[PDB]
Each structure stands twice: as C-alpha cells, then as structure tokens.
Design a protein around this nucleic acid. Structure first.
Lengths: 217, 137, 131, 119, 45, 99
RNA sequence: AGAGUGUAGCUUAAAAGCACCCAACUUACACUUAGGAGAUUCAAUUGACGCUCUGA
C-alpha cells in the first residue's frame, strides 16, 4: 500500500473553573433567586427572627442578626482561590495552570521533511497491537510526564492525510484525568492550546481541519 | 379459501421487524390528521365516498372567466414583509398581543380581501350553491 | 371476510407489541442496559441535569428505560474548637438507558461531561446489583 | 333535510348540515365552514395578506379571535347562520377556541344547529 | 458549557427558601450549594 | 426498601406568609415577558450550536469509518471493539474556584 | 482548475406542511396549553457568490 498508518491523539484537559455567566444568565440567576424567594415557604431562620422580634416587642411594651453578622465576618475573612489565571500565568501557553474555564488540548513541536511544526503526538502502527495500543505507547513515549489519563473509547475520531507515499493521520480523543508534566522547562515545546489558538498553531488540511472533532462547545 | 388483495394493504409499508425503533403517534391529533389523509386517499375497496359522495364528471370544468390579473411576486413579498417588520417594530403591538387586547380592522380586511382573494371564495360559494351546475351547466 | 381480498384489513395486534441484560452483537458491539448515576448535594441541580440528559437522549433517540431515584443520605459534619454540627444532604438520580452503541459512546460521553454542571457526580455503571 | 345520523362509534359526529373546522398549524390558523358532503362553504386563514397585515403573529389567541371575527362576518354575508363546531377536549379547554367561539357568537352566528323536523 | 442545567430554580409546590452558599472542600475549594441557614461558608474537614 | 424525600414533610402546615407580597407590578410583568422570550431565543441558539457539534463529529467518526474500510478490515474490527475496560467513567464537575 | 449544485433541519410544498426551543403540568419523559425563532446567494433559462467532490 502507498500509505503510512500513523496515529494521533487529542489529550484534553477538561475545564476546572465553571464558565462565567453572560449578562442574560446572571440577570436570570437573579430572577430565579427572586421567584424562589417568592414561592418558597417556612424558613426556620426567618421563623426564629420574626418570633424573637415579636417577643422583644412584647418585652419592650411591657437574636438572629448577630449570627448573620458573624457568618458575614467569617465570609469576609475567608479568601477565595483567585481565578484570574491570565494574571497568574502572564501568557505561558505551555503551563497547565492556564485558562480553567475552557478545555485544553496538548500539542508538541516536531520536525519533519514535510512540516517542522506543531503536531499532535504521533506513532507508526506496529503490526501486533491496536491503535489504542499506539495511543497508550505515545502516552508512554511523551517526554517525562505522568499523565494518568483516560481514553474515551476504542473508536477513531479524525482522519486527515497528505501525500509525500501518503502519510495518513488517525486522530484520536483522550481525556486527561489528573496527570502532570515533569521537567516543566522541557527542551521539546509542549503547548496546551484551545481552538482559538489552534487557529494560530495549526495552518491547513492535515493540521487545522482538526476543528471538526476538537470540542469547544 | 383465500383471495389475494387487489392492491396494497393499508399498514403494509410499515416495517414490522422491531416495533420499538419506529417513531410514533403520541397524539390523537397527529393520528387524526393521518387518518383524514388516508380517508381522502382513493382506495380500491368499497367506500362511503363511493356510495354517498357526488360523482361529478372529470371534465375539468371549463373556465369562461376573464384572465387573472398579473402581479409581481418579488416586490409583492418584499412589501408584505416590510409591512410585517414595521408592525413588529411597533412596540405597543407586542404589549397588545401579550396582554391579549389587540384588534383588527374588519372593514379594511374585507375591502382588500375583495381585492385579493374574494373572487376565488365567491366562485367556491357559487359552486356550493349550484349556479355553475344550474345556470351555466 | 376470509374469502375476500380485503381480509385482515382491521388487524392491529401485529402493529402493536406486548407480552436486555448484557446484550452484544457479535461482529458489531452494543452496550446493555446502563445507569447514568447523577448525584448531588443539590436536589435542584441533580434534577435539572437529569431532566437535561433525559431530554437530550429523547432528542437523539437513545431509549431511556427509566428515570428513577436513589435515596437522600443525610450526613452530619461535626467540628470543635460537644462538636458543632452542619447537616448536608445528597440526592441521587439514575437515568437507565437501553440501546447504546460503543460507536456512539464517544458522542455521548464527551457531550455529557462537557455539559456537566458545577459539582455534580456523574458516574455510569452496569445494572447488575444496585436496587 | 336529512342529517347523516349514525357514526356513534367514531369521531367526529357527522349529524350536521354545516361544520366549523379549525386547523392550528405551526405557522397559521385556518378556519373552514364546510357542508356534510365535504365541499368547503367559506374559508378564512391567517395565511392571507388581509389578515397577516393586521396580526403581530399568526399563532396567537389574538390570531384566533381575529379569524373568528372575519369568519363570522363572512358567514353572515354568506347566509350560513347555524353550524356545528366539534372540538376535542383540549381544543375546547384552550383559550384560542374560547375566544374563537366568543367572537363567533358576538359576530352573530349560532354554533348549535336547530333540530330536524321529522314530523 | 456548564450553564444549561445550572440555571434552574426549585420546582416544588412546597419547599424552603434555600440560600446561595459556597462550601469548601478540604483542598480548599468552594461550590455553590443551597442551605437552609444564611451561613455563607460551609467547611468540610 | 425504597423510601424517598419526594414526600412533603409534615412541618409545612400553616405559616406561608413570609411573602404576602403576591401583588406584582406591571413594569415587572412586561420585563419578565420580553425577557422570557429573549431566554427562548438564546436557548434556541445554544441548541443549534450543540446540534452542529453533534452532526460534525458524528460526520468525523463516519469519515473515519469509510477511510478505515478503504485501508483494512482487522483495523476496522479493532477500532469497532466494545473495549470493556473504560466504561466505569467518573469525572468531577467544573468547579467554581480552583484548589 | 473542473463538475453536482443552491427553499430555515427535511420535503416528484409552492413563500406551505412537518420537524425544533422557553414557561405551566409531569420525579422525569410524553401529551396539552400558552408563547418563540426562522429560509428562497445575487443580475436580465442563462451569467456571476457559497457548500461538497475531484488534482497540484
């Protein structure tokens, strides 16, 4: 056959931070708050506050807000884990602590006679294993990293070829569970990239038509 | 003793292989529409339409009218649409429609109904009353 | 009538049907009856995502066997500086689906995990012993 | 005249002379006055420009009320004073058909045919 | 992407007014969960 | 033993007047009507986008299938396996705040 | 560079009928009720903008 059986993967770090709401969505969170307040019944805290107010009125004629204040001050002393990872990482596109509201995918710089550019991690199919085997051996042969990661299923995800007797690319999809990349100052540039910057890093048919199966939603 | 059917059976083009895959009428209204279409279908068995309906000759009843007026459909739909979005741009129309207090001018409706579609409705009602059968054969 | 060509025109019990565990297809492959477990500390969020995944499975034609409930478990968290208490509740939704191909498993897994809300446990199990 | 009695096991009942039939499609509201034989006596639709240019949308209870007032006027104009309307339970409970029947009654048509004089 | 099922209210005829609350989990991480009391921070050991 | 909290607890008996303000204002009602219509249009856009995503990467898996039929059939079988070692899936929901 | 071409998701529909969402009900689905969004790629059968296919 005038073709080369070459596989590739789509290791995706899932979004950790929940995506911020649009103006319509935050307005309607406020509305949903309003209407659930309107259509609820029987708050025990409101019972305690109203009954204590009534008995205080009786005693004045003849509580709960201190608890409100103390939970407010312990809220104001407690700090949140800061979500501004753009400020936390400047523009370090190789770090795993980049944009957490979005989904990320791995990309490696490589040299080839056709293109010395960013590619998805590659292997040539040994005739005694599954292309899932090629996927896990690429995960093993990547540069000094422990990705404990999960494959979505033994089924292909993308198919792009070029002729140079023809390099066929057998794109997969994988899911990073919680692994990380040791030797962060790696000689081989490992970028973590989205679709919007996949526009920057991947130019045409063999590598940029991967927008068919990369998932940004 | 059996006799093969003279035509296609009614529920014959439905595949009976596994009945869980096929989409389904979940509504009496959908079944009613399908059953009315099937009732209006010709059929090769004996029919209430055959025994009770009017058997008029398929003579394709001749037109002895004036030729119809000619209209430019493109600018017609353009002006119809621009009327639609100017009325949908009037803000009080939304308020009237949502508060269910809107209304319609019947005199203008009837006048331009006579302009546009009144002739065909009048022809249909003349056919129902039976002038084309009696007065014009 | 039996001797007439119009015999059997009013038949409906063939069009209607009335009276599986670890199903497979051989050279093809299809998963059996499977549980989308969906638990949360929020009954509201759990019910919302259960309604979402039910509506999506109806839209893309995977036969949902049943959407049922697994009981609220109430846990008392105790902390001291007798220990002061905070009571949390967890509620569970199961979407039990029937016909699921290993080909479309990537469709469904990817889309459900991407649409998963904030802090809802999504786990898919085999219906063997949970009752 | 004869009313076609019978059909007691099916729906709709065909014991009438003229029938109001309302078709609520996903874009348009159609209303027909039709005889028992099946010929359409009078029709009125939100499909027509004469109704489109005064409605905001062709799928409202405002749409149904407008088509009812138009069709009631056309029925008074045609001489059809008595009709039988046969709605489904959800139709009759729907606000569109109630505004339809109110518009027809205030227009002037009676939605109940008189009884046949057998003797 | 995490909004479609998040933007809902309590669909019950009889229910308490549950308040927007951030609870922390032991790695120090806060989730919007609903609680009967106005206590904004809940702690998980 | 199936017992659930779908039942209404006995404690809701006679005090629902924490909000006796069921009177509503006309400007509020107009805002809600226009705004629910905007929500309907927005969800229409989101559903259209997600259907485009479904169709696109189903098309991707299909084109994968015909290219694999072009190349090899044992390859086709070993890419249409049911892989019963990755089904027990678990994933944390997208958190609000990072650790 | 050359062909199939061209009505919103679909139609031997011609500006329609089916699909499709949000609220109410429903654990949920479904039904129903109220709403919602939409299309004829452009110039007098051709000519020239967009998708797919083929090659370099």
């Amino acid at each position: 056959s005038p073709w080369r059986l070459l596989g590739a993967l789509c290791l995706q770090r899932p979004p950790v931070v929940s995506k911020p709401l649009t103006p319509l969505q935050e307005e309607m969170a406020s509305l949903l708050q309003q209407i659930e307040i309107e259509r609820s019944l029987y708050s025990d805290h409101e019972l305690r506050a109203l009954d204590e107010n009534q008995r205080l009125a009786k005693k004045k004629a003849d509580l709960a807000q201190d608890l409100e204040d103390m939970w407010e001050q312990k809220f104001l002393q407690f700090k949140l884990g800061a979500r501004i990872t753009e400020a936390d990482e400047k523009n370090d596109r190789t770090s795993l602590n980049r944009k957490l509201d979005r989904n990320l995918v791995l990309l490696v710089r490589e040299k080839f006679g056709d293109q010395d550019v960013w590619i998805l991690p590659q292997a040539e199919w040994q005739p005694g294993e599954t292309l899932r085997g090629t996927a896990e051996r690429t995960l093993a042969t990547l540069s000094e990293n422990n990705m404990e990661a999960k494959f979505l299923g033994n089924a292909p995800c993308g198919h792009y070829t070029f002729k140079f007797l023809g390099a066929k690319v057998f794109f997969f999809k994988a899911l990073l569970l919680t692994g990380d990349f040791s030797q962060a100052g790696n000689k081989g540039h490992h970028v973590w990239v989205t679709k919007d910057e996949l526009g920057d890093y991947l130019k045409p048919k063999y590598l940029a038509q991967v927008r068919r199966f990369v998932s940004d939603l | 003793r059996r006799t093969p059917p003279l035509g296609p059976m009614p529920n014959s083009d439905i595949d009976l292989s596994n009945l869980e895959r096929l989409e389904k009428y979940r509504s009496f209204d959908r079944y009613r529409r399908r059953a009315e279409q099937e009732a209006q279908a010709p059929h090769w068995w004996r029919t209430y339409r055959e025994y009770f309906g009017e058997k008029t000759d398929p003579k394709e009843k001749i037109d002895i009218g004036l030729p119809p007026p000619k209209v430019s459909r493109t600018q017609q739909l353009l002006e119809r649409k621009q009327a639609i979005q100017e009325l949908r741009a009037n803000v009080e129309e939304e308020r009237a429609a949502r508060l269910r207090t809107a209304s319609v001018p019947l005199d203008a409706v009837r006048a331009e109904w006579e302009r546009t579609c009144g002739p065909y409705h009048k022809q249909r009602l003349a056919e129902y009353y039976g002038l084309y059968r009696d007065l014009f054969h | 009538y039996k001797t007439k060509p119009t015999h059997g025109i009013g038949k409906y019990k063939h069009l209607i049907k009335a009276e599986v565990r670890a199903i497979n297809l051989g050279t093809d492959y299809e998963y059996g009856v499977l549980n989308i477990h969906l638990t949360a500390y929020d009954m509201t969020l759990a019910e919302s995502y259960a309604q979402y995944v039910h509506n999506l499975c109806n839209s893309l034609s995977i036969k949902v066997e049943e959407s049922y409930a697994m009981p609220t478990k109430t846990i008392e968290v105790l902390q001291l500086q007798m220990l002061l208490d905070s009571v949390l509740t967890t509620h569970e939704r199961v979407v039990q689906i029937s016909g699921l191909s290993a080909t479309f498993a990537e469709i469904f897994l990817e889309i459900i995990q991407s649409s998963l809300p904030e802090g809802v446990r999504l786990s898919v199990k085999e219906h063997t012993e949970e009752d | 005249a004869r009313k076609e009695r019978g059909w007691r096991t099916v729906f709709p009942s065909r014991e009438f002379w003229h029938r109001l039939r309302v078709i609520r499609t996903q874009h348009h509201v159609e209303a027909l006055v039709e005889h028992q034989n099946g010929k359409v006596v009078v029709s009125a639709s939100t499909r027509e420009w004469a109704i489109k240019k005064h409605l905001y949308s062709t799928r409202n209870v405002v749409a149904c009320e407008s088509i009812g007032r138009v069709l009631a006027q056309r029925c008074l104009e045609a001489g059809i004073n008595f009709m039988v309307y046969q709605p489904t339970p959800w139709e009759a409970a729907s606000d569109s058909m109630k505004r339809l029947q109110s518009a027809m009654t205030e227009g002037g048509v009676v939605l109940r045919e008189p009884q046949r004089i057998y003797e | 992407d995490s909004s479609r099922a998040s933007l809902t209210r309590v669909h019950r005829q009889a229910y308490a007014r549950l308040y927007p609350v951030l609870l922390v989990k032991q790695d120090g991480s806060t989730i919007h969960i609903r609680y009967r009391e106005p206590r904004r921070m809940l702690a998980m050991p | 033993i199936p017992i659930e909290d779908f039942i209404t607890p006995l404690k809701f008996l006679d005090k629902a007047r924490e909000r006796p303000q069921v009177e509503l204002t006309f400007e509020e009602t107009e805002r809600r009507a226009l705004l629910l219509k905007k929500w309907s249009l927005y969800k229409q856009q989101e559903r259209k986008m997600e259907r485009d995503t479904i169709r696109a990467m189903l098309e991707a898996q299909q084109e994968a299938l015909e290219e694999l039929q072009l190349e090899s059939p044992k390859l086709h079988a070993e890419a249409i396996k049911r892989d019963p070692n990755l089904f027990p899936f678990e994933k944390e929901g997208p958190h609000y705040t990072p650790p």
